[PDB]
Write a protein that binds this DNA or RNA. Structure first.
Lengths: 262, 260, 260, 263
DNA sequence: TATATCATCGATAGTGATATA
DNA sequence: TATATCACTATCGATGATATA
């Protein structure tokens, strides 16, 4: 059962193999010198000196310093109990430290904490050119619109999104639709005209506007004008997610909005 | 030191490594992240983001977002951080109980070995560390038969009130000299009950250079070296010799004439 | 041995745990044997020898005349000061190697660089600290107009590029926040401002800082999280309609700005 | 060469192999996609994506975010210079941090600084037995005595150390020698008695004192009385280095001293 | 014998390669 | 073609064994 004594020492009292063996030897034989320890234990001769000295610091042994160091064991009923008590104080301090750390981390993370869940990533700028990619990107904006939808279309949009707008409107999203006159001839409803008549959305027409745009909440979608590209529907478009930037486009839209209607 | 301070604290007290700590701040910062997005916005290497995010969920700091494409959300700091300390307090409670079990079992195993602890023919021993003072002074108290002279600076016999009271019950004459700063510790103590009841003498003094414990013909004292104390390696001596004890006893009686 | 001393040593003086402890021990006790070091410290006995040998190689300890392997500490005032000196020295050495490398790189990349003309009309730059990596190209390419509303990051340290553009007869309007004014003391921009070579106004604040050069515009987005990680997004757009839009906003700010 | 450019990038601009290769490719070809980068560089296909994004953050590239990310290089004349400048600020901050750390370490170590050289160790307690070890230990005390030497000998000190005492005295060490009367018969004529007569040291004799001791400065050397052992000269002796403890023994010596007879 | 040193393990952490629809 | 993951290196620090004179 000496192995058991040694086993319980390493596991619950911060003693390593040799230190555990050394202490067990002391209790059993009483007073030992490093050399004597080597002959009655499994502690290597060369190590018994620092192992006994080690126990000395841990409170497991008392010593007679001299040419020949004598070591006697502390009564296990004392050292073992003293340890647990000491251990409990160390644990209390570590607990106080973890709690302090938590309070600090919480104050630091307060400003950084984000309650909005990123819908399709953290990117706030996206460059689109394809007809497919332009369509998907626009559908995302409308699908995620919550407050307002401002659409100034001259025809740069590759797809008719009557259903996506109407789906957005039925969700309670305020919608303003601005069209060029020579799009109405192809804009026979096909709803929207219906929703307009029913006052479910606003619909105004204008002959000319140079900066067509799609605004959804705090996002804007616009093209970098390229007349040739627009024909091939490969015109470069930009999506931006920023209230400052969108607020600017929103001012431009309202300038258009107050100038025409049919 | 804002973000980095957060990564600092996380690594120091919540067992996250550097990459895990960074990953968690990012999650909290951006709400949701792909392993790719994480590598992009953070100093966690791309090839490591995958395992790093998997390690965070296993540690309870991150949850795998519904569906696919490997999207991870952070567990709210108030939740994970509070939960971590709880579970840690839980594991500590478990260990504290295992220690108390081990002690009992060890004492059960060491009973046979200790025929005598009659503690030897040696008349001098050294003990390292003031925290280890009572590991010897307790044996002095239990063996005392006639006299006890204790001038405590707060370390000689800390938490040995019961052994002192017991010795008194055995008819050992006891004189206790304390520094006035130790008085409050004696409020609910049973020692005052014995002092005013005249079972032992108890006096106080602002300070005295040489704290000591005398029991019969034994004496215990500490040396004084600043460096040694910084390392918890102060030297304390126990001597069993009538001439030397008589010498220390004279010093005690000098102090005792100035107390209370 | 305050844990904080060992802490600082590891953080700022490139000692490992055992070495940091060893050095405190030396200073504490003045002279130590490898054996004595292991005894009084938490440095393993089997490691004290190399650890002390490593301390001398790092200049923190000197080998006592001996010869029985006794080690003394180099006084903190000496070793600590010398470490910083040598570190300042190595940094000076590296700074020169960097400037050499730069020159050599520019010489090697010369042949490659004939592919520079800013087809694409939009680019993104990460980090407000990287703004000028693009805004510098804008300024040098400016031919007709320059409209700069700076909050302190748009065109930091680009005074010379601005002055140069003006010299080429490019009309310049600079709108600054009043907190940046002191930075212009004796600056050459004021010399041109007072000489009527450029307009310079100040404003308490403005939401959308920007740089307009000809038909190009440069601006930053605004996300707190992104800034914590040095990953703020900045956009460069080359489009007359969009520039016209931003120029309208600029002219709104410009109508409210102090003449400076 | 391409190797030289990549080599200077890794060494002085905090770029790793792939990042360095990637940047050099950008400068050479202008605008690249991750897939394009793989076909004109040594950057592994699977890595080109995170490698290009990495440069993006370091200020070595500009990007068009989209399904297919396009990357353009920053002009090396700009990023390289910007780097050196940024790096100089980081070193500046680090210097302030090292210096601050130094001020604190100095304040913390001030009380701990030790000017006294041990000579024979840090031990302040030593247990000695035997003539050899008892003799050597006493010779050391006398060798290191600087201020005072107090000797109360009844014969427990074993070997006669007249020469070690006289050597100490000639060094300017104040010496008080207290002896038992029945040890005087063995001291004439040599040598201590000569120094006593010449008033180079004090010499007093006393019939009885129960606690013999050797005091050197802040060290005391005494035996744990064992008459049987003392005959076999194997009596247990203790050496202690402490001003408080030595001060106590010194009071006892002085008690004996005021009771002894001169010469 | 009592001085003086080595060997093995696991975990970081930086860095260049490899694998799956 | 993009995603997903691995593999090697050196250092640390913890722990159990070996080497001189």
């Amino acid at each position: 059962s000496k192995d058991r004594m040694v086993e319980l020492l390493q596991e619950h009292f911060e003693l390593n193999l040799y230190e555990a063996r050394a202490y067990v030897a002391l209790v059993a034989f009483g007073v030992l010198t490093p050399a004597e320890l080597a002959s009655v234990s499994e502690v290597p001769a060369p190590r018994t000196y620092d192992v006994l000295r080690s126990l000395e610091k841990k409170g497991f042994a008392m010593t007679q310093p001299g040419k020949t160091n004598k070591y006697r064991p502390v009564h296990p009923a004392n050292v073992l109990e003293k340890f647990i008590q000491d251990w409990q104080e160390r644990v209390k301090e570590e607990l106080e430290a973890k709690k302090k750390a938590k309070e600090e981390l919480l104050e630091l993370m307060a400003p950084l904490i984000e309650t909005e869940v990123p819908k399709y990533g953290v990117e706030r700028v996206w460059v689109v050119r394809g007809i497919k990619n332009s369509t998907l990107k626009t559908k995302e904006m409308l699908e995620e619109a919550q407050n307002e939808i401002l659409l100034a279309d001259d025809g740069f949009i590759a797809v008719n999104l009557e259903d996506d707008i109407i789906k957005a409107v039925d969700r309670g999203v305020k919608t303003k639709i601005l069209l060029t006159k020579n799009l109405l001839p192809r804009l026979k409803a096909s709803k929207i005209i219906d929703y307009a008549k029913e006052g479910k959305l606003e619909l105004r027409a204008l002959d000319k506007f140079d900066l067509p745009m799609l605004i959804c909440d705090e996002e804007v979608f616009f093209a970098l004008e390229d007349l040739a590209a627009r024909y091939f529907n490969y015109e470069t478009q930009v999506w931006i997610k920023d209230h400052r930037v969108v607020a600017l486009f929103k001012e431009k839209f309202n300038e258009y909005w107050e100038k025409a209607e049919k």
